[PDB]
């Protein structure tokens, strides 16, 4: 299973009637390119080291699409304002997700192409890739025009072709380790909580990618009630952290065990509290 995505955003400003436009391309959930209009000199840029080798003719081409999209978002942003009847005098947000999922047979599983306006789903291309699903009374307008104009056929092309083909190039030239996985280094701190009780907190750190699972056990029986945790968080060096905690009576901490599950681990980790 591999995948490609371009995540596009445009936010319309009051007065200065250029919106900020931002686009970021992911390969297997890794940022590999970026375009940000607000930047002093706009241009798609490489955002992982393995992209540098694409010649200049690639970056210009790419960059013109961006300026293309910038405009389409400029205009679509207006069009919408009319549908919803809102003020030229307030900030509005429109986003797009597009790309392909491949399966480990490098066959095409699914292509996506959808949009959000003001943080609510607006229109999405269905899995058939010939029809639209539309929320608002307003996004039906966008739908009819798209059905009439043959919008779907265009996107289907991108999806079943370029997006597949280029995701392969990026995935053979991205041989240069997109493989990177840094395994977690886990440990259990100990924190007295109440009279007769303590918290044991299992930490997973310095791991990449961000998927990981933590569990706590009491003599083989996984814990689900009384498990506190946090959402996975960037350490700020490209890796992630997470922890999970349970409360446990004083003196019995050594027969609770923490398990950590991550790809790039040879086996699943097992640990308990010990100074």
């Amino acid at each position: 299973p591999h995948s490609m995505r371009y995540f596009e955003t445009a936010v319309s400003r009051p007065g200065l009637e250029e919106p900020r436009y931002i686009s970021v391309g992911y390969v297997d959930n890794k940022e590999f390119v970026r375009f940000d209009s607000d930047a002093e000199n706009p241009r798609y840029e490489p955002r992982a080291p393995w992209m540098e080798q694409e010649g200049p003719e690639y970056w210009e081409r790419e960059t013109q699409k961006a300026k293309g999209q910038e405009q389409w978002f400029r205009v679509s942003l207006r069009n919408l304002l009319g549908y919803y009847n809102q003020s030229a005098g307030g900030s509005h947000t429109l986003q797009q997700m597009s790309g392909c999922d491949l399966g480990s047979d490098w066959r095409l599983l699914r292509g996506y192409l959808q949009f959000a306006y003001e943080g609510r789903d607006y229109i999405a291309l269905n899995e058939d890739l010939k029809t639209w699903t539309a929320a608002d009374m307003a996004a039906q307008i966008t739908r009819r025009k798209w059905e009439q104009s043959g919008a779907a056929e265009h996107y289907k092309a991108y999806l079943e072709g370029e997006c597949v083909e280029w995701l392969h190039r990026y995935l053979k030239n991205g041989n240069a380790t997109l493989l990177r996985t840094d395994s977690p280094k886990a440990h259990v701190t100990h924190h007295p909580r109440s009279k007769g009780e303590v918290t044991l907190r299992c930490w997973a750190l310095g791991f990449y990618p961000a998927d990981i699972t933590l569990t706590w056990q009491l003599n083989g029986e996984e814990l689900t009630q009384d498990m506190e945790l946090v959402e996975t968080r960037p350490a700020g060096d490209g890796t992630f952290q997470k922890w999970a905690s349970v409360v446990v009576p004083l003196g019995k901490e050594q027969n609770y065990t923490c398990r950590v599950y991550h790809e790039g681990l040879p086996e699943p980790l097992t640990l308990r509290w010990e100074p």
């Binding site: 371009y6 699409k65 679509s76 069009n79 919408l80 192409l113 966008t142 025009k145 798209w146 104009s149």
Partner: peptide
Amino acid sequence: KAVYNFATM
């Protein structure tokens, strides 16, 4: 390579 949109909304 990124998609380029067709008809606007």
